[PDB]
Amino acid sequence: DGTGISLHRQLRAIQQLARNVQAVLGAFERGTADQMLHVLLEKAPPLAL
Amino acid sequence: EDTEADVPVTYGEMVLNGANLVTALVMGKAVRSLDDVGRHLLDMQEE
């Protein structure tokens, strides 16, 4: 509506969206590292035997 | 009849600009013509 109420409202959604998209960008950065351990434990029988 | 001639005026307005924003999106109360009151609230106590 060309008012300052609108631009605050417009900017809030982007300040969520950027905060949202930074989460999933860090997610595959985390999730790769999560997956890094799983195939290493599908192998590697324990030390004792 | 005085005349048939009139001198009206154009609109007035107030838009949330100076601190009215901060008093609305952080505080709840938004004073119409805040800054002229807000200065004079800092003016009366020294008189």
From Swiss-Prot, chain B:
It comes from Human herpesvirus 2 (strain HG52) (HHV-2). It is found in: Virion; Host nucleus. The chain holds residues 296 to 342 of 1374 of the full protein. Belongs to the herpesviridae major capsid protein family. Homomultimer. Makes the hexons and eleven out of twelve pentons. Interacts with triplex proteins 1/TRX1 and 2/TRX2; adjacent capsomers are linked together in groups of three by triplexes, heterotrimeric complexes composed of one molecule of TRX1 and two molecules of TRX2. Interacts with scaffold protein; this interaction allows efficient MCP transport to the host nucleus. Interacts with capsid vertex component 2/CVC2. Interacts with the small capsomere-interacting protein/SCP. Self-assembles to form an icosahedral capsid with a T=16 symmetry, about 200 nm in diameter, and consisting of 150 hexons and 12 pentons (total of 162 capsomers). Hexons form the edges and faces of the capsid and are each composed of six MCP molecules. In contrast, one penton is found at each of the 12 vertices. Eleven of the pentons are MCP pentamers, while the last vertex is occupied by the portal complex. This is Major capsid protein.
